[PDB]
Amino acid sequence: MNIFEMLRIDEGLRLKIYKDTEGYYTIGIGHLLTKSPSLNAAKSELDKAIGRNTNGVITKDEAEKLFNQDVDAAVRGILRNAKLKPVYDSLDAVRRAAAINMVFQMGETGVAGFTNSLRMLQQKRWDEAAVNLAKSRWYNQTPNRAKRVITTARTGTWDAYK
Ligand SMILES: [Cl-]
Ligand SMILES: [Cl-]
């Protein structure tokens, strides 16, 4: 199990524009296209992203290219962030996949926001961090995925995904 397989489980794969849990226009593997209500703005962003006229539909390959860019952007975003970087450096490779999951789903800014949890993670206070992470809109909004991520952080094992 790795970060790519973990995310593919959590986000699914969809070849046609769709709406996320929050209601945003998304495509492929969790790739947020826009927060704008227009399905036309979405189609617009979509073709810009792919480099062709898609009419809201893409191939598996295309979807895979997008996913590769986003994980890379997630990682680089973590490494470039003054709040995130130290937590990350401090962690083992499984736990690291967990911070990467979060950043991919809620953006660098969001996660950088989780001040307290971050501090507990760095101090390697697992249980307490787990509890604190659950006291969030994130957890309330998508609880089954959040539980899986939270367990990965608390444990350093891939249990929740096996
Ligand atoms: Cl893009
Ligand atoms: Cl969920």
Side-chain angles (χ1 to χ4, degrees):
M1 177 74 80
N2 58 59
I3 185 60
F4 294 80
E5 303 171 3
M6 188 201 200
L7 280 159
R8 162 97 190 43
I9 283 164
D10 279 337
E11 304 278 347
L13 163 69
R14 286 215 237 160
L15 304 195
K16 164 113 250 237
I17 311 202
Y18 68 97
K19 291 201 207 178
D20 77 33
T21 316
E22 289 300 347
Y24 321 111
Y25 280 113
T26 304
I27 208 180
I29 307 142
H31 184 68
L32 171 62
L33 292 163
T34 175
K35 307 177 178 194
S36 139
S38 170
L39 172 81
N40 298 277
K43 280 172 162 213
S44 207
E45 279 311 283
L46 183 57
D47 297 331
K48 166 160 61 98
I50 298 314
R52 75 180 179 69
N53 231 100
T54 68
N55 213 4
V57 178
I58 58 165
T59 71
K60 177 133 183 151
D61 289 358
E62 279 163 357
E64 273 169 3
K65 190 139 188 231
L66 298 176
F67 185 35
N68 276 329
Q69 301 168 174
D70 305 339
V71 176
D72 189 40
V75 180
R76 290 189 287 83
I78 289 169
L79 300 169
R80 229 197 298 114
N81 193 284
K83 278 105 155 327
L84 296 191
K85 174 156 195 310
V87 178
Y88 191 88
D89 290 340
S90 84
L91 298 169
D92 66 88
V94 175
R95 293 182 169 94
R96 281 183 190 163
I100 299 176
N101 198 305
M102 290 182 82
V103 173
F104 178 100
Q105 181 196 1
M106 74 197 140
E108 185 189 321
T109 305
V111 188
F114 289 52
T115 282
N116 309 331
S117 304
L118 294 180
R119 187 182 86 259
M120 302 164 192
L121 286 168
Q122 194 165 354
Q123 303 187 67
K124 330 197 155 248
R125 285 171 148 76
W126 322 122
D127 298 30
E128 6 212 325
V131 159
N132 183 274
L133 277 176
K135 284 178 189 126
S136 51
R137 174 185 205 271
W138 166 64
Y139 180 83
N140 283 113
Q141 301 303 119
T142 55
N144 290 329
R145 156 176 204 160
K147 265 171 245 159
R148 290 205 289 280
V149 174
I150 294 159
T151 289
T152 310
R154 185 195 28 94
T155 89
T157 83
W158 294 112
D159 286 10
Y161 289 79
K162 302 167 326 214

